[PDB]
Design a protein around this nucleic acid. Structure first.
Lengths: 145, 121, 362, 247, 147
RNA sequence: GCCAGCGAAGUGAGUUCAAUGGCUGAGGUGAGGUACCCCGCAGGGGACCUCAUAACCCAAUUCAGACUACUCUCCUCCGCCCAUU
């Protein structure tokens, strides 16, 4: 069945690259309103480990990221909303039509919230990211960037 | 008349090491002397590392009284042992002295010009 | 294992050469001009009390240099700065008091290459293409990014120039204390005090130290022998160590007492009544060192009493690139230095002193 | 490539603290980390406002180098002998969440085993005073160096006596022989107002211990920044960093 | 998971067998530590507080087998000749002398001790020429042949 | 599924209160620089100096195969990003 599902593909082509990126702008508004309806607390200050639990347990599909430090300097300085997510890479789309494939090998991403900024070290974040919300996130290893 | 060209390259011909150290005595009772500093250098390495290692060939250059600065030389064998002996703070009478090293070189010119600050404004 | 670590080595490289000033193969002028950053320029003349005015006017006019507090790097990549200082002369720039193994250190070359040695954090935050330069075994300590501004000045609308401009302006604004100089090779004059008028620029002159030393025991040399003949001439390396001892204001005899100081003077030698000592300290231009070396070469045109004069130059101990390609590291010390022992028959000795971890040029 | 990072055991009064900060900023130091010795007999927890550096110091320490603002850390050194006191430190993983680097000091071999095996700490304190012999098992050291545990060696035996010098140099030679020297950082204590030597010669005090001719200095300059990194990944989040940024 | 130990044999050569009877493990350990503390400092003597220890001692025979580490046996064996002036209940002057340095390996160290003992027996025989000791020599040879 | 041992000499290292990769110099390879030499296609070849040659780990009867831990090192299939025609 798997090899029979791999006939056409489920991945992008050349034809969805020219889709006029302002049409992808309501995805950012969808993610922003989803963060507004998920957290629902802003004003005094509250519990950054609640924020770490929301950032671990939620799917980051369709979110705004920006590479802030990486082992390759050409990867750094790339912003955009993300579209796919694989075992050790994920694919984003940027400004005027071109898409980039950023590997989660040794790198860290700035994510801009409605009023917050979060650094996410994309080292341990891997392996079919539905496994992230499921189970097995322990405390192992530090990342020097 | 003589005019020619020749390339000569050496490997470790230095055989000496020099240390410029400024002294920072804690108490105001500064009864220094040129011989007593040498006696402290002998008595420190004796109790700290050894009497055999205390009589390493060492001497003192430009021993300054008010400026509280000096240069100590040892050859390339016991420089590490001299650094650790001056590190572990051997005392004289009971007034504990802070021995803080400014600079170490194998050259008396790069040490003498400046290495530490390289401009003081 | 540990006992060998107590006494293994620091690394030493000491290279001596002999050459002629009237030789066409002599590359002393290239070695002085292509050496960029300099701190201490001293010269020594035996048997000469009163200095001539022609050399005194050259000593009193070795500078000036400039010091700018908190200057951003994106000022250094503007086309006005390239067409003003780089394309019309030799512009020299270096950060102040930032360690090469610890902090970020930026230097500017007269060929147009802005070379900056960064740590891992700044190399990741700026996002510029470089190469791994200084290691810690398996880990990497310091990177070096080189940006050729003369190639980018031909195409200012290229993607490389706007990438570097976005990296320096909006991505990571880096500011440092800069020492600046500009050797004028242009018909259109424009001072540096008017260009960097927004920041606190300070003009500085190099410090001049003069000394007249009495009863100095100078060794006897042969021009056509580097290793030294037995019982006639001395060795140039022992003469260099004695030179450092004299420049440390230390000149005494054997002193038998409790504080024993055994110091063998290089023998056979000659007593000198007056020794003239001059030390220039600051941001020394290499063209002034070229004119100083030519004047010390032409000093032996007249019959003088000095058999050989000494010109020692110590560079900056905190520069990324010295000796045209070589990296200056800091393993508990170590410097780089070059000396000239000028005889009376236009022969000279080229010495090169290397610190701990640095490669030596020919 | 962050040099000038040590751990100090120094609190008596504000005047001696200002003197030690001025001395460290004068000689060679750009990060000051203050330890707080807590033994198993007292069992006190005063974490909220015990020190208050920034409300009492004057706005900047000035150094002779790059003139950068010194980051000041407040660390906790807990002397743990009893296994129930280690269970009390197990209870403090959720109750009070401060003190960015938590430093345990073990005395029992089973407790040192579970410290490197299960107990979530940052840097294990190893000091030997007055006849403390201790054996080393190699697979927990291997799990420790794979995890990121940097071994602290707090030294000040040179000021009081010479027998303490002997026991510290013997324990340090045993550590360098068995542990093989992967991540071990040394640091000085400060009881008297002048108990600090030159920063470049701390490398030779670690070289007398051994560990390399140069990777002693390289290992302390790397592993102290890695220790601050491990404390930050324990404090903020294990993979995430969330900071409030209001321009 | 192990450390390569080194071992050393030393013979006490002296007359007046009260010196032969005056041996103890703690006394010899404190003597060696005190005479290393005169020669070497904390780094030399404190490494002997963890590495060096007494291993094999004989009162009448005077052969002492001692342990020492890989990176410290040169320091220990250089500190061995400077063991002078043992003060005790009498006015004695004992002194150590090295026979051979064996690189660990206790078994061949005991093998070399047997050949050294046989050389110490057989060479002393012809110069003395006395039957009262020769009978005990014959008994010792017979008991060794029974082994 | 069950059913078969030999107390006597001494492993191209064979120890067991548990030895064996120690120092120096030139060549190998990855690199840089040249005021050296030979040959005339701008150049090519040899010569001189320096740096790097690590880590994983340690044998007690051997071998075969599988495993896990590697990166100075070599043969390939590759991906992403940067720059050029």
């Amino acid at each position: 069945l798997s090899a029979r599902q791999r006939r056409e593909l489920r991945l992008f082509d050349i034809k969805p690259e020219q889709q006029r990126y302002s049409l992808f702008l309501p995805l950012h508004e969808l993610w922003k309103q989803y963060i507004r309806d998920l957290c629902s607390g802003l004003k005094p200050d509250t519990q950054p480990q609640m924020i770490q639990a929301k950032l671990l347990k939620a799917d980051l599909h369709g979110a705004i990221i920006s590479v802030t430090k990486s082992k390759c300097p050409s990867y750094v300085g790339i912003t955009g909303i993300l579209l796919q997510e694989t075992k050790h890479i994920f694919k984003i789309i940027t400004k005027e039509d071109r898409l980039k494939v950023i590997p989660k090998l040794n790198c860290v991403f700035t994510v801009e919230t409605d009023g917050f900024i979060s650094y996410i070290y994309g080292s341990k974040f891997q392996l079919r990211s539905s496994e992230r919300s499921a189970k097995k996130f322990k405390a192992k290893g530090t990342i020097d960037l | 008349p003589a005019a020619t060209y020749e390339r000569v390259v050496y490997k470790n011909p230095s055989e000496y090491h020099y240390m410029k150290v400024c002294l920072e005595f804690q108490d105001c009772g500064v009864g220094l002397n040129a011989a007593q500093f040498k006696q402290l250098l002998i008595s420190a390495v004796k109790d700290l590392f050894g009497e055999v290692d205390a009589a390493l060939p060492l001497d003192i250059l430009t021993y300054e009284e008010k400026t509280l600065s000096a240069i100590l030389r040892i050859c390339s064998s016991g420089l590490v042992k001299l650094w650790s002996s001056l590190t572990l703070l051997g005392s004289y009478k009971g007034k504990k002295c802070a021995f803080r090293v400014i600079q170490v070189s194998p050259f008396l010119l790069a040490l003498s010009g400046n290495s530490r600050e390289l401009v003081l404004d | 294992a540990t006992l060998r670590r107590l006494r293994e080595a620091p690394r030493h490289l000491l290279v001596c050469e002999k050459s002629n000033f009237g030789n066409h193969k002599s590359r002393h002028r290239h070695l002085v001009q292509t050496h960029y950053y300099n701190y201490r320029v001293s010269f020594l003349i035996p048997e000469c009390g009163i200095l001539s005015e022609e050399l005194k006017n050259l000593v009193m006019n070795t500078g000036p240099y400039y010091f700018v507090k908190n200057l951003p790097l994106h000022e250094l990549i503007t086309p006005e700065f390239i067409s003003t200082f780089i394309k019309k002369g030799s512009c020299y720039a270096l950060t102040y008091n930032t360690h090469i193994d610890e902090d970020n250190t930026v230097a500017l070359l007269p060929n147009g290459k802005l070379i900056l040695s960064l740590d891992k954090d700044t190399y990741e935050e700026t996002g510029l293409q470089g190469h791994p330069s200084q290691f810690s075994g398996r880990k990497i300590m310091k990177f070096i990014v080189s940006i050729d501004l003369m190639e980018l000045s031909l195409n200012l609308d290229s993607k490389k120039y706007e990438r570097i401009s976005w990296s320096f302006k909006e991505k990571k604004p880096l500011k440092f204390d800069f020492l600046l100089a500009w050797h004028k090779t242009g018909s259109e004059e424009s001072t540096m005090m008017s260009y960097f008028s927004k920041y606190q620029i300070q003009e500085h002159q190099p410090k001049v130290a003069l000394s007249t030393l009495r009863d100095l025991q100078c060794p006897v040399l042969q021009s056509s022998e580097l290793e030294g003949t037995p019982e006639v001439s001395c060795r140039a390396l022992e003469l260099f160590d004695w030179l450092g001892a004299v420049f440390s204001n230390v000149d005494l005899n054997n002193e038998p007492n409790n504080f024993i100081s055994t110091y063998c003077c290089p023998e056979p030698s000659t007593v000198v009544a007056k020794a003239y000592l001059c030390t220039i300290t600051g941001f020394i231009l290499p063209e002034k060192i070229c004119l100083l070396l030519e004047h010390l070469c032409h000093y032996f045109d007249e019959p003088k009493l000095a058999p050989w004069v000494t010109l020692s130059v110590q560079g900056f101990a905190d520069s990324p690139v010295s000796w045209e390609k070589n990296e200056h590291g800091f393993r508990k010390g170590g410097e780089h230095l070059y000396n000239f022992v000028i005889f009376n028959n236009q022969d000279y000795w080229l010495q090169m002193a290397v610190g701990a971890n640095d490669h030596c040029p020919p | 490539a962050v040099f000038a990072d040590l751990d100090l055991r120094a609190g008596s009064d504000l005047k001696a603290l200002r003197g030690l900060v001025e001395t460290a900023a004068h000689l060679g130091y750009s990060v000051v980390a203050i330890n707080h010795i807590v033994d198993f007999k007292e069992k006190k927890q005063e974490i909220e406002k015990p020190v208050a550096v920034s409300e009492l110091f004057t706005t900047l320490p000035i150094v002779q180098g790059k003139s950068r603002p010194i980051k000041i850390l407040t660390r906790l050194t807990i002397i743990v002998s009893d296994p129930s006191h280690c269970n009390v430190l197990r209870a403090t993983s959720s109750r009070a969440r401060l003190y960015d680097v938590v430093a345990v000091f073990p005395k029992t071999e089973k407790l040192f085993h579970i410290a490197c095996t299960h107990l979530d700490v940052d840097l294990v304190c190893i000091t030997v005073t007055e006849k403390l012999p201790f054996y080393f098992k190699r697979p927990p050291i291997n799990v420790a160096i794979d995890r990121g545990l940097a071994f602290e060696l707090v030294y000040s035996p040179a000021i009081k006596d010479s027998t303490m010098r002997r026991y510290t140099i013997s324990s340090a030679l045993n550590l360098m022989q068995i542990c093989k020297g992967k991540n071990v950082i040394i640091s000085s204590a400060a009881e008297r107002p002048l108990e600090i030597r030159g920063p470049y010669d701390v490398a030779n005090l670690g070289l007398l211990f051994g560990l390399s001719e140069s990777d002693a200095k390289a290992a302390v300059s790397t592993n102290c920044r890695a220790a601050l990194l491990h404390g930050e990944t324990r404090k903020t989040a294990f993979g995430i960093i969330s900071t409030v940024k209001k321009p | 998971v192990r450390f390569k130990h080194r071992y050393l044999l030393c013979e006490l050569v002296s007359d007046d067998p009260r010196c032969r009877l005056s041996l103890d493990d703690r006394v010899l350990s404190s003597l060696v530590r005190d005479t290393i503390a005169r020669v070497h400092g904390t780094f030399g003597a404190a490494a002997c507080s963890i590495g060096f220890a007494v291993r094999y001692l004989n009162a009448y025979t005077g052969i002492v087998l001692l342990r020492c580490r890989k990176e410290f046996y040169q320091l220990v064996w250089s500190a061995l000749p400077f063991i002078t002036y043992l003060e005790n209940k009498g006015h004695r002057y004992p002194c150590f002398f090295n026979t051979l340095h064996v690189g660990g390996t206790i078994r061949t160290c005991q093998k070399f001790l047997i050949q050294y003992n046989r050389r110490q027996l057989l060479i002393l025989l012809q110069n003395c020429t006395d039957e009262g000791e020769r009978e005990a020599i014959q008994k010792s040879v017979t008991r060794s042949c029974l082994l």
